[PDB]
Design a protein around this ligand. Structure first.
Ligand SMILES: N=C(N)c1ccc(CNC(=O)[C@@H]2CCN2C(=O)[C@H](NCC(=O)O)C2CCCCC2)cc1
Ligand SMILES: *[C@@H]1O[C@H](CO)[C@@H](O)[C@H](O)[C@H]1NC(C)=O
Ligand code: NA
Ligand code: NA
Lengths: 10, 29, 251
C-alpha cells in the first residue's frame, strides 16, 4: 500500500 | 542547536496549533 | 495512535518515519535531533523475541512526512543510515529498560518548513516538566486500533501518570528509565500510542522558553488504549549522558 519511492533512494 | 524545538510554521510565525493550549493549561506550576 | 486526531501540517517537523526497504513498510517512528542524528527506540531495530535485528542497509529514514503511504515529492527527504547505536544496557529480555537507539545519517538533512529538530531536555527541563498531570504529545503513523491504519500522521495529548499508578497497572517491573502516560478510566478522555508508533517522540512545550522538548520515546504497552492501562515511554533525560557520549565520540 506504500507508493514507490524514487530509484535514487535504493 | 540554538534553533531546536521552534517550528517554522508555528513558533517562528507566532502561530499556535489547535491543541498546544491544552498542554500549557496542564502546566500548573 | 488510538483515539488521536490528524496532525496539522508542520505540527511535528522532527517526526521521522523508519521505513523498511523490502517489503516496503512502516518500521517505526523516530525523531530528528540535529541535521545528522535521529533518535528512536532500540526495540525498533533489535528485538530477538520477534526475530527483529535490522542493519543500516535494511532501512531508510523519511523526514518531513504527513501522509503515511504517499511519496511526498518536494516535501519529504529520504536519508540513508551511516551507523546505528543501540544502548549497551538495553533490556529486551524483560521490560525494554533503556529502550533507546541513535542513527547517524550518511549526509546532513536540510531543514525546511516541514523538517526541523526537536530539543533534548536538560536536568532542569525534566525536573520542571516531568510531573504527574502535566501533558505531553505523542505522534505516529501506527495502528488506529489495538485489533486500521491512518491516512496521515496522528497526534494525541496525554497526561503523565503518578509512578505508583503506573506500577499498579501492570505485572511488568518499571524502572526509573521509564514513565507512563494516559488518561485514567474516571477521566473520561482516551488515547494511546500503539504498534507502529514505537520510537516516536513524547514532546512537551516549555512554558518558560516556548520550545518543544522530547521527554519520551514510545516504548511499550499491554494492548492499546485499554482502561486502567497506560503507555510506557523511554525517559530521554535519564539516558542523555549516553546520547551525549555517542554524539561526542561519533558525530
Ligand atoms: N502505548 C502502547 N499501548 C503501546 C506502544 C507501543 C507498542 C509497540 N511496542 C512493542 O510492541 C514492544 C516490543 C515488545 N513490546 C511491547 O509493547 C510488549 N507488549 C506488546 C503488546 O501489548 O502488543 C510489552 C509486553 C510487556 C513487557 C514489555 C513489552 C505497543 C503498545
Ligand atoms: C544481530 O545482527 C548482527 C549482524 O549485524 C549480529 O552480529 C548479532 O549478534 C545479532 N544478534 C544480536 C542479539 O545482536
Ligand atoms: Na504492579
Ligand atoms: Na488506558
Amino acid at each position: 500500500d506504500f507508493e514507490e519511492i524514487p530509484g535514487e533512494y535504493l | 542547536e540554538a534553533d531546536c524545538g521552534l517550528r517554522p510554521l508555528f513558533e517562528k510565525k507566532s502561530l499556535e496549533d489547535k491543541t498546544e493550549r491544552e498542554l500549557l493549561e496542564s502546566y500548573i506550576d | 495512535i488510538v483515539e488521536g486526531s490528524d496532525a496539522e501540517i508542520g505540527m511535528s517537523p522532527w517526526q521521522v518515519m523508519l521505513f523498511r526497504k523490502s517489503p516496503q513498510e512502516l518500521l517505526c517512528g523516530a525523531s530528528l535531533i540535529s541535521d545528522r542524528w535521529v533518535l528512536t527506540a532500540a526495540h525498533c531495530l533489535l528485538y530477538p523475541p520477534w526475530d527483529k535485528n535490522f542493519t543500516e542497509n535494511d532501512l531508510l529514514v523519511r523526514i518531513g512526512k504527513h501522509s503515511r503511504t504517499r511519496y511526498e515529492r518536494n516535501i519529504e527527504k529520504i536519508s540513508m543510515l551511516e551507523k546505528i547505536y543501540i544502548h549497551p544496557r538495553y533490556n529486551w529480555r524483560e521490560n525494554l529498560d533503556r529502550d533507546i537507539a541513535l542513527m547517524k545519517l550518511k549526509k546532513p538533512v536540510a531543514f525546511s518548513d516541514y523538517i526541523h529538530p526537536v530539543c533534548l531536555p536538560d536536568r532542569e527541563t525534566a525536573a520542571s516538566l516531568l510531573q504527574a498531570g502535566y501533558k505531553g504529545r505523542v505522534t505516529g503513523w501506527g495502528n488506529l486500533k489495538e485489533t486500521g491504519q491512518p491516512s496521515v500522521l496522528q497526534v494525541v495529548n496525554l497526561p503523565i501518570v503518578e509512578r505508583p499508578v503506573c506500577k499498579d497497572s501492570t505485572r511488568i517491573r518499571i524502572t526509573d528509565n521509564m514513565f507512563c502516560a494516559g488518561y485514567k478510566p474516571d477521566e473520561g478522555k482516551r488515547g494511546d500510542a500503539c504498534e507502529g508508533d514505537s520510537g516516536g517522540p513524547f514532546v512537551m512545550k516549555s512554558p518558560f522558553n516556548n520550545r518543544w522538548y522530547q521527554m519520551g520515546i514510545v516504548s511499550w504497552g499491554e494492548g492499546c488504549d485499554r482502561d486502567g492501562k497506560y503507555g510506557f515511554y523511554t525517559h530521554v533525560f535519564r539516558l542523555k549522558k549516553w546520547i551525549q557520549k555517542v554524539i561526542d565520540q561519533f558525530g
